[PDB]
Enzyme design. Structure first.
Site, PDB file in Angstrom:
ATOM      1  N   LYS A 283      -8.478   1.615  -2.746  1.00  0.00           N
ATOM      2  CA  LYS A 283      -8.317   1.174  -1.501  1.00  0.00           C
ATOM      3  C   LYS A 283      -8.147   2.634  -0.680  1.00  0.00           C
ATOM      4  O   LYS A 283      -8.891   2.933   0.375  1.00  0.00           O
ATOM      5  CB  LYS A 283      -6.996   0.582  -1.030  1.00  0.00           C
ATOM      6  CG  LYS A 283      -6.978   0.092   0.260  1.00  0.00           C
ATOM      7  CD  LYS A 283      -5.574  -0.405   0.330  1.00  0.00           C
ATOM      8  CE  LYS A 283      -5.222  -0.560   1.867  1.00  0.00           C
ATOM      9  NZ  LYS A 283      -4.220  -1.610   2.378  1.00  0.00           N
TER      10      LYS A 283
ATOM     11  N   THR B  69       0.945  -0.848   0.076  1.00  0.00           N
ATOM     12  CA  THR B  69      -0.088  -0.001   0.049  1.00  0.00           C
ATOM     13  C   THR B  69       1.072   1.245   0.093  1.00  0.00           C
ATOM     14  O   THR B  69       1.653   1.619   0.805  1.00  0.00           O
ATOM     15  CB  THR B  69      -0.929  -0.063   1.409  1.00  0.00           C
ATOM     16  OG1 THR B  69      -1.986  -1.381   1.030  1.00  0.00           O
ATOM     17  CG2 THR B  69      -2.029   1.129   1.139  1.00  0.00           C
TER      18      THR B  69
ATOM     19  N   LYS C 213      -1.619   5.361   8.862  1.00  0.00           N
ATOM     20  CA  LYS C 213      -0.839   5.030   7.651  1.00  0.00           C
ATOM     21  C   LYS C 213      -1.433   5.354   6.305  1.00  0.00           C
ATOM     22  O   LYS C 213      -1.328   6.188   5.395  1.00  0.00           O
ATOM     23  CB  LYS C 213      -0.241   3.608   7.687  1.00  0.00           C
ATOM     24  CG  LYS C 213       0.206   3.451   5.987  1.00  0.00           C
ATOM     25  CD  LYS C 213       1.148   2.203   5.905  1.00  0.00           C
ATOM     26  CE  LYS C 213       1.976   1.839   4.607  1.00  0.00           C
ATOM     27  NZ  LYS C 213       2.082   0.819   4.428  1.00  0.00           N
TER      28      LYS C 213
END
Ligand SMILES: NC(=O)c1ccc[n+]([C@@H]2O[C@H](COP(=O)([O-])OP(=O)(O)OC[C@H]3O[C@@H](n4cnc5c(N)ncnc54)[C@H](O)[C@@H]3O)[C@@H](O)[C@H]2O)c1
Ligand SMILES: C[C@@H](CCC(=O)O)C(=O)O
Ligand SMILES: C[C@@H](CCC(=O)O)C(=O)O
Lengths: 291, 290
Positions: free
Chosen positions: B168, B93, B243
């Protein structure tokens, strides 16, 4: 069971609600100080009276569907002494939790039973008798009231003591407002990222982010053809009414000292948007995030 | 049937690679931590001293690495060691910008490349139920599908390169906002004398419903399994949510987007992660008075 019901407030919600009670075999005694409202209600079988005290005089149940707490308070002050002792009052207006408990107490001090039963579903819910009633007050009083509410309702939920109906509603609608802005933000960011609206829709709805503001009220046209975005942002649920509910949320926050950062931010966003776009569906707030 | 080099054998990379071994793949591995590498070799991964060695004999190269900078540096370190038309899958990611840059770098070497970040955490990784959100060409995804399947509950093609990262980061920004909003509502309800169970029943039956409440309910009781009933043990940690929100903020900056609520949530969680990084992100309910 067949009951005589006074219905005070015969506007966009009141009129279709009263029509369903007439349909169900109830004798309905109406008052609204706007004669056009009274007239439409009369056309569907409400016996319309000259004054609220008159409508209330021979009623087993008194329903109010009014714009503000101030108006409800004023109405109760006008009518409670005219009502027969131990009449059941249902306020299905959307008002502050504080106002609700104030008027509840006032009603009970005059010897009347009282519930707060504000509704969700809008005019379309009202006409189809698919409204959700969210009820605050005694369980036994709700038991009594059930056969009056059923002909108007998709759902009836007991939320707790007096004011819990208004409380549940305003909490849900605060969350909703936040979700509608957040969904709009994701759709615009996606657009700037080169992610297609259809793609983002498929993901969020299949993932942890899914919610009515996307699956039903998707603020970009295409993915949900029934959503207001496909129809010039015609309400639906207008910005004017969302902004009202957010004002009531902010009243509740202020009354409690609660901290609601995003709820309050959303409140300030919808208040600015309401100034010039009161008439558009609340999903139209997506416009403030573009150009 | 296929040889896979797995670069990054950490909390996620280790169980994912075990599933690949479990489905009959030859898995070659690299990680800079001996403990990670050792655990991975215990479940059948052939561990190498460097990423270029791991890549040498591979048909597929999967990265699971902490940042775009590390992913970029890995690509430049291994691309010349790879055979031509090797399939690169980045399941890290990282930012949309970084994803696209590394995609272009890989393709310039005659490789095929997807971004396929995942949702589901260590739990999902071990259970082989991760949701892969994929960017790249459909034909490349088709070729990748038999490798993704044994790690995956769900595989979604999001669009062209970068679109997996994009989807996402957009879902998680919304999730963060929802989690905070739901927490606000529960503490508001409580101060109004509305019970947690009544609020829960109403919202779950009404327009406000979302996973943040129906599964992650931040007050104990209405959802016995939610982290609120278990001292806010993740679940999805504040560290990880913080994050993803950082990455949303990069994307917002990069595009000049207006995201007031997403940004506000980002601020809230960045603060909260200074003190409670190890708790489920639903624990934010108890930092509203800060
Ligand atoms: N989509 C919706 O319309 C919707 C959905 C849910 C809840 N609500 C809530 O329902 C309430 C009313 O909805 P509406 O659309 O019928 O409002 P409306 O403003 O169309 O009608 C209010 C009516 O009350 C009348 N009134 C004022 N003072 C009175 C008195 N003393 N006695 C009797 N009648 C009086 C007015 O003349 C008017 O016709 C509001 O509290 C609103 O926020 C609306
Ligand atoms: C909503 C009510 C039934 C009444 C109706 O469907 O109109 C109930 O289910 O409690
Ligand atoms: C093909 C399947 C993934 C296989 C798995 O369940 O591991 C899916 O897309 O759901």
């Amino acid at each position: 069971m067949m009951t005589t019901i006074a219905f005070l407030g015969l506007g966009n919600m009141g009129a279709p609600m009263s029509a369903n009670l007439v349909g169900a075999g109830h004798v309905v005694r109406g008052f609204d100080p706007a004669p056009t409202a009274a007239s439409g209600a009369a056309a569907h079988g409400v016996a319309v009276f000259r004054s609220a005290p008159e409508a209330v005089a021979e009623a087993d149940v008194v329903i109010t569907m009014l714009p503000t707490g101030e108006v409800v308070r004023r109405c109760y002050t006008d009518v409670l002494a005219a009502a027969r002792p131990a009449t059941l009052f249902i306020d299905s207006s959307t008002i502050s939790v504080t106002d609700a408990r104030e008027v509840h107490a006032l009603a009970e001090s005059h010897g009347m039973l009282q519930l707060d039963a504000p509704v969700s579903g809008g005019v379309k819910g009202a006409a189809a008798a698919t409204l959700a009633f969210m009820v605050g007050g005694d369980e036994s009083t709700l038991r009594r009231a059930r056969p009056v509410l059923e002909p108007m309702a998709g759902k009836i939920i007991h939320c707790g003591a007096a004011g819990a109906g208004q409380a549940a509603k305003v909490c849900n609608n605060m969350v909703l407002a936040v979700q509608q802005i957040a969904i709009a933000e994701a759709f615009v960011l996606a657009e700037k990222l080169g992610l297609s609206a259809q793609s983002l829709f498929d993901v969020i709805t299949g993932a942890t982010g899914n919610c009515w503001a996307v699956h039903t009220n998707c603020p970009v046209p295409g993915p949900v053809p029934t959503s207001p975005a496909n129809n010039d942002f015609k309400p639906g649920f207008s910005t004017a009414l969302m902004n009202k509910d957010l004002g009531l949320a902010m009243d509740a926050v202020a009354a409690t000292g609660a901290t609601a950062p995003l709820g309050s931010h959303a409140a300030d966003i919808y208040a600015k948007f309401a100034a010039d776009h009161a008439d558009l569906d609340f999903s139209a707030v997506i416009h403030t995030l573009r150009a």
